[PDB]
């Protein structure tokens, strides 16, 4: 499950 | 999960500078961003700024003018907020808050910092 | 630069009834490449830190209860409080995170009507 931080900012 | 503890009340004078931290602890993430977020007495909440400590990343509001500088230490899980330039209108309560994949899901207690003559 | 609205400023529920609060944003926040839709709801009770009730739109924070609900289109949204409660009195703010600088609205103040 990939995780998002923030707009431009998700990571695997 | 995680807590996070934050540095104790400031009083500056109005052109001084303060820095606040904001200390995790609990659970491990390898992915995270702190914010911080500021509340002038009897207002709403602003977003200052964060940082994403594995990445290197940060962002910032512009309306701050570069007054704002946002620091990790990865060695003791600690972040940092450094405001300089202060003035009366800084005065405010600043909390930090993590997020994980979620939203901000946990927030620190809040530090007062008053900014007067 | 996107702004929040939030409506009503204050809204008075009675004990075990539902509030519903909400939310407008200038622009959509649906990111179509992922699907979701990147507006938050947290709360802040009188004289505390500020706490995560929804993200994305429609799901509830971990320790939420099924009574608080999100819902709405890319651009107006609401907050649903079933059977309030003294617990629930405080500021609601919606929060937008499709695009940096996050954004908050005003903050909704709910208390409870006698």
């Known amino acids: 499950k990939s995780i998002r931080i923030g707009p431009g900012q998700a990571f695997y | 999960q995680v807590q996070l503890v934050q540095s104790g009340a400031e009083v500056k004078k109005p052109g001084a500078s303060v820095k606040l931290s904001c200390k995790a602890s609990?659970?491990?993430?390898?992915?995270?961003?702190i914010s911080w977020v500021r509340q002038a007495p009897g207002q709403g909440l602003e977003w200052m700024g964060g940082?994403?400590?594995?990445?290197?990343?940060?962002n910032y509001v512009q309306r701050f003018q570069g007054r704002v500088t946002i620091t990790a230490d990865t060695s003791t899980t600690t972040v940092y907020m450094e405001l300089s330039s202060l003035t009366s209108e800084d005065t405010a309560v600043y909390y930090c808050?993590?997020?994980?994949?979620?939203?901000?899901?946990?927030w620190g207690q809040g530090v007062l910092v008053t900014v007067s003559s | 630069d996107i702004v929040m609205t939030q409506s009503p400023l204050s809204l008075p529920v009675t004990p075990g009834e539902t509030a519903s609060i909400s939310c407008r944003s200038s622009?959509?926040?649906?990111?179509?490449?992922?699907?979701?839709?990147?507006l938050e709801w947290y709360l802040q009770k009188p004289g505390q830190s500020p706490q995560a009730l929804i993200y994305?739109?429609?799901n509830r924070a971990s320790g939420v209860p099924d009574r608080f609900s999100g819902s709405g289109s890319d651009t107006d949204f609401t907050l649903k409080i079933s059977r309030v409660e003294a617990e629930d009195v405080g500021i609601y703010y919606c929060?937008?995170?499709?695009?940096?600088?996050?954004?908050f609205g005003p903050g909704t103040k709910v208390d409870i009507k006698r």
């Open positions: 929060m937008q995170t499709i695009e940096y600088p996050f954004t």
């Open positions: 808050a993590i997020r994980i994949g979620r939203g901000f899901d946990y």
């Open positions: 609990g659970n491990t993430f390898s992915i995270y961003g």
């Open positions: 940082i994403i400590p594995p990445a290197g990343l940060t």
């Open positions: 622009q959509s926040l649906l990111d179509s490449e992922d699907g979701n839709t990147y």
């Open positions: 994305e739109a429609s």
